[PDB]
Structure formats: C-alpha cells, structure tokens
Amino acid sequence: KVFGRCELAAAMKRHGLDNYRGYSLGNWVCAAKFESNFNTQATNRNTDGSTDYGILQINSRWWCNDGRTPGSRNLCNIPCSALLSSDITASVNCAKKIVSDGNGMNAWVAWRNRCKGTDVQAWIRGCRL
C-alpha cells in the first residue's frame, strides 16, 4: 500500500514511534518518504547482494531473513516479506530495534542525508494526530 503522509503519521504514532528514543514523529515520516515514498512494497537491492524491504527499507543483511543473503543475520526474527505488508506493525517493531542498536536513526541513510537537521515537524503539519 502507498500511505498518505498524515495516514502514515497516524499509524506510526499509534504504534509508539512518536518520540521513540527521542525521535519525534516527523523524523519517522521523513525517513519513510525518502526511503520508500510511503510504499510498503518498496524493495531495493544493495551492491553487496542484500535487499532493503518496505516502508523503512530494512536491510536483509542484519534485520530480516530473505533466504538469499548468504551469512546474514535475522535480528528482528522475521521474514523480510513481512516488512512489505499493508500493516506496518512488523516494520515498526523491527525499526524499534534498529534505532536502539546504537547509531539511532543514522542507520537510515536517507534520514541522515535528507531529514537529519531539517524541519521534520513540517512532515506532520496539518495531520490530525
């Protein structure tokens, strides 16, 4: 599914992402916009042969199992395909472990390069939260 900005904003907050580990909701929404264009079905292959999955482009090298990333970890204990669902629960729960893993939201390259330092509140503006 392709989310609306405010719609995703609401599901994200419902799922406890607002101020999770100090990151206001607009950070999460901004990362999703640039990672996936709010498309839960986004996949992208990395040069190392791992694949990024879903709304938050979660990487198969560390976080989910896709059976074709030799010698990878599945730290979120999920099939990568679960990160492609119209329900973002899987993506959120896994995102929760990623942002706790020590580098915070910097784990998301598009967040670091496109959201970090910008007015991310602009991403939840006008939304009925």
Coordinates of N, CA and C in Angstrom, one line a residue:
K1 N 0.8 -1.2 0.0 CA 0.0 0.0 0.0 C 0.9 1.3 0.0
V2 N 0.4 2.3 -0.7 CA 1.1 3.6 -0.6 C 0.3 4.4 0.5
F3 N 1.0 4.9 1.5 CA 0.4 5.6 2.6 C 0.3 7.1 2.2
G4 N -0.7 7.7 2.8 CA -0.8 9.1 2.8 C 0.2 9.6 3.9
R5 N 0.7 10.8 3.8 CA 1.6 11.4 4.8 C 0.9 11.4 6.1
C6 N -0.2 12.1 6.3 CA -0.9 12.1 7.6 C -1.3 10.7 8.0
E7 N -1.7 9.8 7.1 CA -2.2 8.5 7.4 C -1.1 7.7 8.0
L8 N 0.1 7.7 7.4 CA 1.3 7.0 7.9 C 1.7 7.7 9.3
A9 N 1.6 9.0 9.3 CA 1.9 9.7 10.6 C 1.0 9.1 11.7
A10 N -0.2 8.9 11.5 CA -1.2 8.3 12.5 C -0.9 6.9 12.8
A11 N -0.6 6.0 11.9 CA -0.3 4.6 12.2 C 1.0 4.5 13.0
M12 N 2.0 5.4 12.6 CA 3.3 5.4 13.3 C 3.2 5.8 14.7
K13 N 2.4 6.9 15.0 CA 2.2 7.3 16.4 C 1.3 6.2 17.2
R14 N 0.4 5.6 16.5 CA -0.5 4.6 17.1 C 0.5 3.4 17.6
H15 N 1.5 3.2 16.8 CA 2.4 2.1 17.0 C 3.6 2.5 17.9
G16 N 3.6 3.7 18.5 CA 4.5 4.1 19.6 C 5.8 4.7 19.0
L17 N 5.8 5.1 17.8 CA 7.0 5.7 17.2 C 7.3 7.1 17.6
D18 N 6.2 7.9 18.0 CA 6.4 9.3 18.4 C 7.3 9.3 19.6
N19 N 8.4 10.1 19.5 CA 9.5 10.3 20.5 C 10.1 9.0 21.0
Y20 N 10.0 7.9 20.1 CA 10.8 6.7 20.5 C 12.2 7.0 20.4
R21 N 12.9 6.8 21.5 CA 14.4 7.1 21.7 C 14.7 8.5 21.3
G22 N 13.7 9.4 21.6 CA 14.0 10.8 21.3 C 13.7 11.3 19.9
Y23 N 13.2 10.5 19.1 CA 12.9 10.9 17.7 C 11.5 11.2 17.5
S24 N 11.2 12.5 17.3 CA 9.8 13.0 17.2 C 9.2 12.3 15.9
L25 N 7.9 12.4 15.8 CA 7.2 11.6 14.7 C 7.6 12.1 13.3
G26 N 7.8 13.3 13.1 CA 8.3 13.8 11.8 C 9.5 13.2 11.2
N27 N 10.4 12.8 12.1 CA 11.7 12.1 11.7 C 11.3 10.7 11.0
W28 N 10.4 10.0 11.6 CA 10.0 8.7 11.1 C 9.3 8.9 9.8
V29 N 8.4 9.9 9.7 CA 7.7 10.1 8.5 C 8.6 10.6 7.4
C30 N 9.5 11.4 7.7 CA 10.5 11.9 6.7 C 11.4 10.8 6.2
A31 N 11.8 9.9 7.1 CA 12.6 8.7 6.7 C 11.8 7.8 5.8
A32 N 10.5 7.6 6.0 CA 9.7 6.8 5.2 C 9.6 7.4 3.8
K33 N 9.4 8.7 3.8 CA 9.1 9.4 2.5 C 10.3 9.2 1.6
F34 N 11.5 9.3 2.1 CA 12.7 9.3 1.2 C 13.2 7.9 1.1
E35 N 12.8 7.0 2.0 CA 13.3 5.6 1.8 C 12.4 4.9 0.8
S36 N 11.1 5.1 0.9 CA 10.2 4.2 0.2 C 9.1 4.9 -0.6
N37 N 9.0 6.2 -0.5 CA 7.9 7.1 -0.9 C 6.6 6.6 -0.3
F38 N 6.6 6.2 0.9 CA 5.5 5.7 1.7 C 4.9 4.4 1.1
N39 N 5.7 3.7 0.3 CA 5.2 2.5 -0.4 C 5.6 1.3 0.4
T40 N 4.7 0.5 1.0 CA 5.1 -0.6 1.8 C 5.8 -1.7 1.0
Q41 N 5.6 -1.6 -0.3 CA 6.1 -2.7 -1.1 C 7.5 -2.5 -1.8
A42 N 8.0 -1.3 -1.5 CA 9.4 -1.0 -1.9 C 10.4 -2.1 -1.6
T43 N 11.1 -2.5 -2.6 CA 12.3 -3.3 -2.4 C 13.5 -2.6 -3.1
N44 N 14.7 -2.8 -2.6 CA 15.9 -2.3 -3.3 C 17.1 -3.2 -3.0
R45 N 17.8 -3.6 -4.1 CA 19.0 -4.4 -3.9 C 20.2 -3.6 -3.7
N46 N 21.0 -4.1 -2.7 CA 22.3 -3.4 -2.5 C 23.4 -4.1 -3.2
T47 N 24.4 -3.4 -3.6 CA 25.6 -3.9 -4.3 C 26.2 -5.1 -3.5
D48 N 26.0 -5.3 -2.2 CA 26.5 -6.4 -1.5 C 25.6 -7.6 -1.6
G49 N 24.4 -7.4 -2.3 CA 23.5 -8.5 -2.5 C 22.5 -8.7 -1.5
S50 N 22.5 -7.9 -0.4 CA 21.4 -7.8 0.5 C 20.3 -6.9 -0.2
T51 N 19.1 -7.0 0.4 CA 18.0 -6.2 -0.2 C 17.3 -5.4 1.0
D52 N 16.9 -4.2 0.6 CA 16.1 -3.4 1.6 C 14.6 -3.6 1.4
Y53 N 13.9 -3.7 2.5 CA 12.5 -4.0 2.4 C 11.5 -3.0 3.1
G54 N 10.5 -2.6 2.3 CA 9.3 -2.0 2.9 C 9.5 -0.5 3.1
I55 N 8.5 0.0 3.9 CA 8.3 1.4 4.2 C 9.6 2.1 4.8
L56 N 10.3 1.3 5.5 CA 11.5 1.8 6.2 C 12.8 1.2 5.7
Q57 N 12.7 0.5 4.5 CA 13.8 -0.1 3.8 C 14.8 -0.8 4.7
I58 N 14.3 -1.8 5.4 CA 15.0 -2.5 6.4 C 15.8 -3.6 5.7
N59 N 17.1 -3.6 6.1 CA 18.1 -4.3 5.3 C 18.3 -5.8 5.7
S60 N 18.3 -6.7 4.7 CA 18.3 -8.1 4.9 C 19.6 -8.7 5.4
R61 N 20.7 -7.8 5.4 CA 22.0 -8.3 5.9 C 22.0 -8.5 7.4
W62 N 21.2 -7.6 8.1 CA 21.2 -7.7 9.5 C 19.8 -8.0 10.1
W63 N 18.7 -7.6 9.5 CA 17.5 -7.5 10.3 C 16.4 -8.5 9.9
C64 N 16.4 -9.0 8.7 CA 15.3 -9.9 8.4 C 15.8 -11.1 7.6
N65 N 15.1 -12.1 7.4 CA 15.6 -13.3 6.6 C 14.9 -13.3 5.3
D66 N 15.7 -13.4 4.2 CA 15.1 -13.5 2.9 C 15.6 -14.7 2.1
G67 N 16.4 -15.5 2.8 CA 16.9 -16.7 2.3 C 17.9 -16.6 1.1
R68 N 18.3 -15.3 0.8 CA 19.3 -15.2 -0.3 C 20.3 -14.1 0.0
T69 N 20.6 -13.9 1.3 CA 21.7 -13.0 1.7 C 22.7 -13.8 2.5
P70 N 23.5 -14.6 1.8 CA 24.4 -15.6 2.5 C 25.1 -15.0 3.7
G71 N 25.1 -15.7 4.8 CA 25.8 -15.3 6.0 C 25.3 -13.9 6.6
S72 N 24.0 -13.8 6.6 CA 23.3 -12.6 7.1 C 22.7 -13.0 8.4
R73 N 22.3 -11.9 9.2 CA 21.6 -12.1 10.4 C 20.1 -11.8 10.1
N74 N 19.3 -12.3 11.0 CA 17.8 -12.0 11.1 C 17.6 -11.5 12.5
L75 N 18.0 -10.3 12.8 CA 17.9 -9.8 14.2 C 16.5 -9.4 14.6
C76 N 15.7 -9.1 13.6 CA 14.3 -8.9 14.0 C 13.4 -10.1 14.0
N77 N 14.0 -11.3 13.7 CA 13.4 -12.6 13.7 C 12.1 -12.6 12.8
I78 N 12.2 -12.1 11.6 CA 11.0 -12.1 10.7 C 11.4 -12.4 9.3
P79 N 10.4 -12.9 8.5 CA 10.7 -12.9 7.1 C 10.7 -11.5 6.5
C80 N 11.7 -11.2 5.6 CA 11.7 -9.8 5.0 C 10.4 -9.5 4.4
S81 N 9.7 -10.5 3.8 CA 8.5 -10.2 3.1 C 7.4 -9.7 4.1
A82 N 7.5 -10.0 5.4 CA 6.6 -9.4 6.4 C 6.7 -7.9 6.4
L83 N 7.8 -7.4 6.0 CA 8.1 -5.9 6.0 C 7.4 -5.2 4.8
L84 N 6.8 -6.0 3.9 CA 6.1 -5.5 2.8 C 4.6 -5.4 2.9
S85 N 4.1 -5.8 4.1 CA 2.7 -5.8 4.3 C 2.0 -4.4 4.4
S86 N 0.7 -4.3 4.2 CA 0.0 -3.1 4.3 C -0.1 -2.7 5.8
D87 N 0.1 -3.7 6.7 CA 0.2 -3.4 8.1 C 1.7 -3.1 8.5
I88 N 1.9 -2.0 9.1 CA 3.3 -1.6 9.3 C 3.9 -2.1 10.6
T89 N 3.1 -2.9 11.4 CA 3.5 -3.4 12.7 C 4.9 -4.0 12.6
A90 N 5.1 -5.0 11.7 CA 6.3 -5.7 11.6 C 7.4 -4.7 11.4
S91 N 7.2 -3.7 10.4 CA 8.2 -2.8 10.1 C 8.6 -1.9 11.2
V92 N 7.6 -1.5 12.0 CA 7.7 -0.7 13.2 C 8.5 -1.4 14.3
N93 N 8.1 -2.6 14.6 CA 8.7 -3.3 15.7 C 10.2 -3.5 15.4
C94 N 10.5 -3.8 14.1 CA 11.9 -4.0 13.7 C 12.7 -2.7 13.7
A95 N 12.0 -1.7 13.3 CA 12.6 -0.3 13.3 C 12.9 0.1 14.8
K96 N 12.1 -0.3 15.7 CA 12.3 -0.1 17.1 C 13.7 -0.7 17.6
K97 N 14.0 -1.9 17.1 CA 15.3 -2.5 17.5 C 16.4 -1.8 16.7
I98 N 16.2 -1.4 15.5 CA 17.3 -0.8 14.7 C 17.7 0.5 15.4
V99 N 16.8 1.3 15.7 CA 17.1 2.7 16.2 C 17.7 2.6 17.6
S100 N 17.6 1.5 18.2 CA 18.2 1.2 19.6 C 19.6 0.6 19.5
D101 N 20.0 0.3 18.3 CA 21.2 -0.5 18.1 C 22.5 0.3 18.2
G102 N 22.3 1.6 18.6 CA 23.5 2.4 18.9 C 23.7 3.6 18.0
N103 N 23.4 3.5 16.8 CA 23.6 4.7 15.8 C 22.3 5.4 15.6
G104 N 21.3 5.1 16.4 CA 20.0 5.8 16.2 C 19.4 5.7 14.8
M105 N 18.9 6.9 14.4 CA 18.2 6.9 13.1 C 19.3 7.0 11.9
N106 N 20.5 7.2 12.3 CA 21.6 7.3 11.3 C 21.8 6.0 10.5
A107 N 21.2 5.0 11.0 CA 21.1 3.7 10.3 C 20.4 3.8 9.0
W108 N 19.5 4.8 8.9 CA 18.8 5.1 7.6 C 19.5 6.2 6.9
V109 N 20.1 5.8 5.8 CA 21.0 6.7 5.0 C 20.2 8.0 4.5
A110 N 19.0 7.7 4.2 CA 18.1 8.8 3.6 C 17.7 9.7 4.7
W111 N 17.6 9.2 5.9 CA 17.3 10.1 7.1 C 18.5 11.0 7.4
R112 N 19.7 10.3 7.4 CA 20.9 11.1 7.8 C 21.1 12.2 6.7
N113 N 20.9 11.8 5.4 CA 21.2 12.8 4.4 C 20.1 13.7 4.0
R114 N 18.9 13.4 4.4 CA 17.7 14.2 3.9 C 16.8 14.7 5.0
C115 N 16.9 14.2 6.2 CA 16.0 14.5 7.3 C 16.7 15.2 8.5
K116 N 17.8 14.6 8.8 CA 18.6 15.0 9.9 C 18.9 16.5 9.8
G117 N 18.5 17.3 10.8 CA 18.8 18.7 10.8 C 17.8 19.6 10.1
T118 N 16.8 19.0 9.5 CA 15.8 19.8 8.8 C 14.5 19.9 9.6
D119 N 13.6 20.8 9.2 CA 12.4 21.0 10.0 C 11.4 19.8 9.7
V120 N 11.6 18.7 10.5 CA 10.9 17.5 10.2 C 9.4 17.6 10.7
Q121 N 9.1 18.5 11.6 CA 7.8 18.8 12.1 C 6.9 19.1 10.9
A122 N 7.5 19.7 9.9 CA 6.8 20.0 8.7 C 6.1 18.8 8.0
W123 N 6.6 17.6 8.4 CA 6.0 16.4 7.9 C 4.7 15.9 8.6
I124 N 4.5 16.4 9.8 CA 3.2 16.0 10.5 C 2.3 17.2 10.5
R125 N 2.6 18.3 9.8 CA 1.8 19.5 9.8 C 0.5 19.2 9.2
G126 N -0.6 19.7 9.7 CA -1.9 19.6 9.2 C -2.6 18.2 9.5
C127 N -1.8 17.3 10.0 CA -2.3 16.0 10.3 C -3.1 15.9 11.7
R128 N -4.2 15.2 11.6 CA -5.0 15.0 12.8 C -4.4 13.9 13.6
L129 N -3.6 14.2 14.6 CA -2.9 13.1 15.3 C -3.5 12.8 16.7

